[PDB]
Design an enzyme around this catalytic site. Sequence first.
Site, PDB file in Angstrom:
ATOM      1  N   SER A   1      16.432 -51.313 -28.375  1.00 22.21           N
ATOM      2  CA  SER A   1      16.811 -49.874 -28.699  1.00 22.21           C
ATOM      3  C   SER A   1      15.750 -48.855 -28.338  1.00 22.21           C
ATOM      4  O   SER A   1      16.227 -47.538 -28.200  1.00 22.21           O
ATOM      5  CB  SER A   1      16.800 -49.765 -30.246  1.00 22.21           C
TER       6      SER A   1
ATOM      7  N   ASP B   1      24.364 -43.373 -32.212  1.00 22.50           N
ATOM      8  CA  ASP B   1      23.396 -43.893 -33.165  1.00 22.50           C
ATOM      9  C   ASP B   1      23.703 -43.479 -34.426  1.00 22.50           C
ATOM     10  O   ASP B   1      24.808 -43.514 -34.997  1.00 22.50           O
ATOM     11  CB  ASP B   1      22.011 -43.890 -32.731  1.00 22.50           C
TER      12      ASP B   1
ATOM     13  N   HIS C   1      16.644 -44.548 -37.150  1.00 22.70           N
ATOM     14  CA  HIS C   1      16.851 -45.622 -36.127  1.00 22.70           C
ATOM     15  C   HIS C   1      17.199 -44.219 -34.887  1.00 22.70           C
ATOM     16  O   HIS C   1      16.657 -44.194 -33.725  1.00 22.70           O
ATOM     17  CB  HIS C   1      17.721 -46.510 -36.080  1.00 22.70           C
TER      18      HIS C   1
ATOM     19  N   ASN D   1      18.337 -57.838 -28.717  1.00 25.11           N
ATOM     20  CA  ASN D   1      17.125 -58.332 -29.212  1.00 25.11           C
ATOM     21  C   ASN D   1      17.248 -59.794 -29.559  1.00 25.11           C
ATOM     22  O   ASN D   1      16.618 -60.258 -30.620  1.00 25.11           O
ATOM     23  CB  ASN D   1      16.720 -57.638 -30.518  1.00 25.11           C
TER      24      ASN D   1
END
Lengths: 7, 279
Positions: free
Chosen positions: B224, B39, B69, B161
């Site tokens: 996520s 990430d 994130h 998404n």
Amino acid sequence: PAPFAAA
Amino acid sequence: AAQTNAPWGLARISSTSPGTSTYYYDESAGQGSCVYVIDTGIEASHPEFEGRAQMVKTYYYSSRDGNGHGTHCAGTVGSRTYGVAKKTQLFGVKVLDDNGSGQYSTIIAGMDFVASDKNNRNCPKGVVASLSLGGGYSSSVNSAAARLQSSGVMVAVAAGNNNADARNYSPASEPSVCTVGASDRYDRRSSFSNYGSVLDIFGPGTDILSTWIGGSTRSISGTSMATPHVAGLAAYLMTLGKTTAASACRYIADTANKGDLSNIPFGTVNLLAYNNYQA
Ligand SMILES: [Ca+2]
Ligand SMILES: [Ca+2]
């Protein structure tokens, strides 16, 4: 190209 | 063990029903397992990680999470308050820059890195990788995810998404990994969650409280956020000896809450990650 944003 | 006033998603993962607020889990808590969070990095100094997180690789000028994130996702895997597997070891691999983006070549290198690097780490209960990232279909990205899985790592990836079929996104569309859709606290498919035959499981993804950079916390939404619930669950179950890296996605699907979710399109699994913990 990339993930699903900064979020 | 019982954590009162837990984030709703943690409570959901240990419940047959929506609408409760305590997370119940075996106190082993993923001890002896390892989860790689591939990430934007992890703010390992965050008190919530208790020294159990570390950066192991970056492809950028720094290993610092300048975004948040990756720290949020790592928190859902394994932070003391916000995590599923509260005693796992967390390893950060920074394939995404501080704007949250990364080239597929870098993402692939990061996956191959984890497949090797696990041999440098002590993970007697097994190894998981959480990939809250993706873009359009790429056979090379899918192949990297497949290799990582084949190497003995439980790979959990975000479905995406796009409110679309995950077949057109990577690494979501790689069949051999664990592709994770998102739900909300009322057991609805999250509005943005991808769907389709390639999904293996859903996890909590709307309004998920976790760690953030600067030693902070916040609530955000996405597949996520669902993905690290599943990655942490895998680590937890592997520590308990209930499953292995090769079999954990299937085990999670086998033992999921079935038929609880709404707005699941015909042909997508109606399976919500569940730890089946009985005190
Ligand atoms: Ca119910
Ligand atoms: Ca799969």
